[PDB]
RNA sequence: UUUGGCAUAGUUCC
C-alpha cells in the first residue's frame, strides 16, 4: 500500500472541478492559480 | 389594589417614576427559522447568516 | 428562482 519510492512526486494529480469550484466575472481560486504557475515552470 | 378582582394586596407595592430607555435590540430583527433553504457551492451545506 | 469570496471593526449572551 506505500512503497517508499512513491514519496518522491514524480505525477501530480489535480483535484477535479468540484474541490476548486469557480466564482461567479469568472475568478480562479488559488488552488488553480497556483496549478497554473506550476504546469507553467513544468513546460518552461 | 388587584386589577382582576379589585381587593387590595396585603403587601404595599413601592412605586415611583424612573427613566427607562428602549435598547437597540428588538426581536423583529433577531426572530429567524429555516427548513430547507439555501445552500453553500463549496459544501453543499446551509448558508450562513 | 435564482446564489460572489477575503479581510477588519463593533455589539449580544454566558
New binding site residues.
Given amino acids: 500500500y506505500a512503497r517508499p519510492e512513491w514519496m518522491i512526486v514524480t505525477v501530480l494529480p489535480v483535484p477535479p472541478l468540484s474541490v476548486r469550484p469557480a ?2 466575472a469568472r ?1 480562479q481560486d488559488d488552488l488553480t492559480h497556483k496549478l497554473a504557475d506550476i504546469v507553467k515552470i513544468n513546460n518552461q | 389594589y388587584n386589577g382582576f378582582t379589585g381587593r387590595k394586596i396585603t403587601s404595599q407595592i413601592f412605586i415611583g417614576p424612573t427613566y427607562y430607555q428602549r435598547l437597540k ?1 428588538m426581536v423583529d430583527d433577531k426572530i429567524h427559522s429555516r427548513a430547507r433553504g ?4 463549496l459544501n453543499r451545506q446551509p ?1 450562513e447568516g
Avoid at chain 2, 38 to 41: D, R, Y
Fill in positions: 466564482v461567479v475568478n | 435590540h439555501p445552500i453553500q457551492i448558508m
